[PDB]
Amino acid sequence: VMDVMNRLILAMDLMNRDDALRVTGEVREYIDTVKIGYPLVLSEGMDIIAEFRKRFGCRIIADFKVADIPETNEKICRATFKAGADAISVHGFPGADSVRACLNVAEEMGREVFLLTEMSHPGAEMFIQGAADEIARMGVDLGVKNYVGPSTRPERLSRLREIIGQDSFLISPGVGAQGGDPGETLRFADAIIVGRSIYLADNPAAAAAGIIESIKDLL
């Protein structure tokens, strides 16, 4: 599995290149893995991935939550990996053929898929929660190794860890702004994803250092 420094992944959802580069540079001593999603990519272009690699040499997870039919999923993955992303996130709810399409491209291109199981926001309870255990099991059957699950529901995150096993890699958003606790989340997740608590801070470096101090005994 990827070796994420300090078990902390920055969710870089600022939408201006200058601010995104500044904040990421400020926390680079603490974080070597950055999640870049559509807020930044649709604002600044896929070349933002290139710029991050050039400036910081951080791993990049393209958080695109791929959720189309298999043929379109393949195209999205190909374009994303062409641009230099190490990994891409994929929704499981559109079913196994859609996930397999992404896995096939990732295999061909030597990159990784992260399967999004249950989401962290309140609306996730309407439809996603009820499907999440089966989505996780589907991922295991398909050979998925990397997963995303919610910091905001420790009981659900624990169950998802059970389903995927200790050998699978699990990252977890919802820490800080959405209410999840870093230490508690790391009981189950390999790494926590943190966005606003860092990037909206007066001193993002101090914010990251503070989170790390709070989980020091967990590495």
Q: Is 194 in the site for ligand BMP (CB under 6 A)?
A: yes
Ligand-binding site membership of 67 (annotated)? yes
State the catalytic residue, choosing from 65, 75, 82, 145.
65
Q: Examine residue 68 and tell whether it contacts ligand BMP (CB under 6 A).
A: yes
Q: What is the token pair recorded at 24?
A: 């990421």
> Applying CB under 6 A, does 63 fall inside the site for ligand BMP?
yes
| d(C-alpha 176, C-alpha 170), whole Å | 18
Active site residue 54: no
Of the two residues 8 and 99, which places its CB atom closer to a copy of itself in the complex? Answer: 99
Is 209 a binding residue for a copy of itself by CB under 8 A? The answer is: no
Q: What is the total count of residues that contact a copy of itself (CB under 8 A)?
A: 48
The answer to whether the beta carbons of residues 96 and 73 sit under 8 Å apart is no
Nearer to ligand BMP (CB atom), residue 32 or residue 118: 118
Q: Is 82 annotated as a binding residue?
A: no
Q: Measured from the CB atom, is 173 or 204 closer to ligand BMP?
A: 173
Torsion sign across C-alpha atoms 9, 200, 124, 73: negative
**Structure tokens that stand for 86 in this block:** 């190490």
Going by C-alpha positions, the residue among 199, 205, 198, 196 that lies closest to residue 20 is: 199
Cβ proximity of 188 and 180 under 8 Å:
no
Find the largest Cα–Cα distance for the chain.
45
Q: Is 35 annotated as a binding residue?
A: yes
Does 204 interact with ligand BMP (rule: CB under 6 A)?
no
What are the DSSP E strand ranges found in the chain? 8-12, 33-37, 59-66, 87-91, 112-116, 146-148, 169-172, 191-194
State both tokens at 219.
């590495």
Q: Which does residue 96 touch among a copy of itself, ligand BMP, none (CB within 5 to 8 A, set by kind)?
A: a copy of itself
Mark the binding-site residues, compressed into ranges.
Answer: 13, 35, 63-72, 120, 173-183, 195-196
Name the residues annotated as catalytic: 65
Would you tell me which residues interact with a copy of itself (CB under 8 A)?
A: 13, 15, 37-39, 41-43, 45-46, 64-65, 67-70, 72, 75-76, 78-80, 82-83, 91-99, 119-128, 131, 134-135, 138, 178
